[PDB]
Amino acid sequence: STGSATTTPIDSLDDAYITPVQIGTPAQTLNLDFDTGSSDLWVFSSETTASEVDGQTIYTPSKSTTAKLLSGATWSISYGDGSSSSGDVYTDTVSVGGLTVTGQAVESAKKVSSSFTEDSTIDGLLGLAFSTLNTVSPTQQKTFFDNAKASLDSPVFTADLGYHAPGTYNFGFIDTTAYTGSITYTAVSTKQGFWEWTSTGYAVGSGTFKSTSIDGIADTGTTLLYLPATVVSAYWAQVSGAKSSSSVGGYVFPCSATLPSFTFGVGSARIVIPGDYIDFGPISTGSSSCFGGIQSSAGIGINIFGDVALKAAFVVFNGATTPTLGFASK
């Protein structure tokens, strides 16, 4: 089997992407944030504290003839950005772009943190990291991909995120029309439960490529590109007036600037992030100070190849017995 679904930016900055997901019988369609940095499929629901729901579409398990309470199961998750959610668990039928899993754990939120409430466009998350990170207790549950894998034509999914435009998540096949040149594959460590890999280096603008190993995670659920302070300083030094602002929480730059591109290495291959992908707009409405899309990972504890990086590529998440990651230009 295969599936193919369009993913759409939630706003004009590409702060996140939502993908429609069918849950239950009859189908209830929710728009979920596909997140290769976590492993829980959780939704706003009829059980979510009412004051914490503000415009989201909810899953109502009592209206699904295929929903079953997973007795005794609870979940609770905290994300790198400080947000969180928790609740109980159902199993139900879940379909993405025509690919159906029966008996998928659907984690129903009883509580969500303010950042989730405040974002009306995201009805929940669909985790695509390794199932070892799943938070369901006392019996850990499998991700949608893990459950689908054996049925897929090939045990892969691909992320093709757009810049200020829709893109595609495919399951079970590689669309050879969706990228240019070849896909370069690189090793993955699953030791931390992430799609963790090592970039071979970087360049700023038309500058020379610096060969250096950068361990990090391919994370569709993180907006920005978080890299070591040395790398990030080298980038922003090429932007007149750019500075790190403790009050704002990272590098800012004059909105009048033209940003240089940023290149990262995948083996001997190179992925070029155009400068405009690195512009996250005014820090507050009407400001002429703009927020940068490349930020320091210092004090995160891990480098993160988030949407800024991934949207410059066609990305293969290869879930073979030994997982790997592939990147192509597009």
Can you spell out the DSSP letters for 278-316? Answer: GEEEESSTT-SEEEESEEE-TTTSSEEE-HHHHTTSEEE
The answer to whether residue 244 is catalytic is no
130 and 195 share a domain?
no
121 and 247 share a domain?
no
Please say which residue of 127, 151, 174 terminates a domain. Answer: 174
19 and 124 share a domain?
yes
39 and 144 share a domain?
yes
Task: List the catalytic residue out of 35, 88, 146, 307.
Answer: 35
196 and 146 share a domain?
no
The DSSP letter of residue 249 is T
Rounding to the nearest 10 degrees, give the CA dihedral for residues 88, 192, 154, 199: 140
The range of the structural domain enclosing residue 192 comes to 175-330
The answer to whether residue 213 is catalytic is no
* Cross-strand pairs, 305: 218, 225
Q: Nearest 5 degrees, angle CA 319-CA 91-CA 67?
A: 140
27 and 169 share a domain?
yes
Task: List the catalytic residue out of 39, 199, 296, 297.
Answer: 199
Give me the resolution in angstroms, 1 decimal: 1.2
61 and 189 share a domain?
no
188 and 125 share a domain?
no
164 and 195 share a domain?
no
Distance CA 38, CA 117 (A): 19
10 and 146 share a domain?
yes
What is the number of other CB atoms lying within 10 angstroms of the CB of residue 111? Answer: 14
Token code pair at residue 201: 């280096």
Find the CATH number of the domain harbouring 81: 2.40.70.10
Query: Phi/psi of residue 124, each to 5°?
Result: 150, -175
Nearest of 193, 184, 237, 233 to residue 77 by alpha carbon: 193
The answer for residues whose C-beta is within 8 angstroms of residue 328's C-beta and 6 or more apart is 179, 180, 181, 182, 183, 184, 313, 314, 316
Angstrom distances, CA of residue 70 to CA of 67, 89, 105, 139: 9, 5, 8, 10
200 and 262 share a domain?
yes
Which DSSP string do the residues of 17-84 spell out, in sequence order? EEEEEEETTTTEEEEEEEETT---EEE-BTTS-GGG-SS---B-GGG-TT-EEEEEEEEEEE-TTS-E
Number of structural domains the chain divides into = 2
216: Cα separation from own chain's centroid: 14
Distance CA 26, CA 3 (A): 19
Solved with: X-ray
72 and 122 share a domain?
yes
Please say which residue of 174, 201, 227 terminates a domain. Answer: 174
* Cross-strand pairs, 132: none
Token code pair at residue 170: 């495919």
Please say which residue of 148, 174, 200 terminates a domain. Answer: 174
